[PDB]
Scaffold this active site. Structure first.
Site, PDB file in Angstrom:
ATOM      1  N   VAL A 141      -9.039  -5.082  -6.126  1.00 45.80           N
ATOM      2  CA  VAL A 141      -8.872  -3.683  -5.741  1.00 45.80           C
ATOM      3  C   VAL A 141      -7.703  -3.517  -4.787  1.00 45.80           C
ATOM      4  CG1 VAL A 141      -9.912  -1.703  -4.573  1.00 45.80           C
ATOM      5  CG2 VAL A 141     -11.318  -3.171  -5.992  1.00 45.80           C
ATOM      6  N   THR A 149      -5.676  -0.081  -2.674  1.00 42.15           N
ATOM      7  CA  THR A 149      -5.534   1.347  -2.460  1.00 42.15           C
ATOM      8  C   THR A 149      -4.110   1.690  -2.058  1.00 42.15           C
ATOM      9  OG1 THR A 149      -7.854   1.630  -1.813  1.00 42.15           O
ATOM     10  CG2 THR A 149      -6.310   3.338  -1.107  1.00 42.15           C
ATOM     11  N   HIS A 203      -3.336  -4.398   8.116  1.00 44.17           N
ATOM     12  CA  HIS A 203      -4.347  -4.656   7.101  1.00 44.17           C
ATOM     13  C   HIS A 203      -5.118  -3.375   6.788  1.00 44.17           C
ATOM     14  CE1 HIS A 203      -8.609  -5.848   6.075  1.00 44.17           C
ATOM     15  NE2 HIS A 203      -7.951  -6.533   5.156  1.00 44.17           N
ATOM     16  N   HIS A 257       0.706  -1.274   0.000  1.00 46.68           N
ATOM     17  CA  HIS A 257       0.000   0.000   0.000  1.00 46.68           C
ATOM     18  C   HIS A 257       0.737   1.330   0.000  1.00 46.68           C
ATOM     19  CE1 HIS A 257      -3.724  -2.259   0.633  1.00 46.68           C
ATOM     20  NE2 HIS A 257      -3.166  -2.873   1.658  1.00 46.68           N
TER      21      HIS A 257
END
Length: 111
Positions: A37, A39, A103, A10
């Protein structure tokens, strides 16, 4: 799953808008196929880690607003898969364990 992997998946220091090139990495191959997906958080790792200072075990919504780029798979194809991009500035929810983010739980609110 842990701090080291969370960072790799991430966190990026500079803005990279091209989801197609950044998502083409083995770490994003879940269940044989390309991840649906992901981010990206444009920030130093220290500030992201700070979301969890003093937190032993729970989802925490950051008080810091981050520049984000979310990459969403448009179709399942052989690698590399095609991804669309959505940039925004918002607070994020992360699971904090032993004062470390492990997470990515969500954008704007915790589940």
């Amino acid at each position: 799953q842990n701090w080291a992997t969370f960072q790799q998946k991430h966190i990026i220091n500079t803005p990279i808008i091209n989801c197609n090139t950044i998502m083409d990495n083995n770490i994003y191959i879940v269940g044989g196929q390309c991840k649906r997906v992901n981010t990206f958080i444009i920030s130093s790792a220290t500030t992201v880690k700070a979301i969890c200072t003093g937190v032993i075990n729970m989802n925490v919504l950051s008080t810091t607003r981050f520049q984000l780029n979310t990459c969403t798979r448009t179709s399942i194809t052989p690698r590399p898969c095609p991804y669309s991009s959505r940039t925004e500035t918002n607070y994020i929810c992360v699971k904090c364990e032993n004062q470390y983010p492990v997470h990515f739980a969500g954008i704007g609110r915790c589940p």
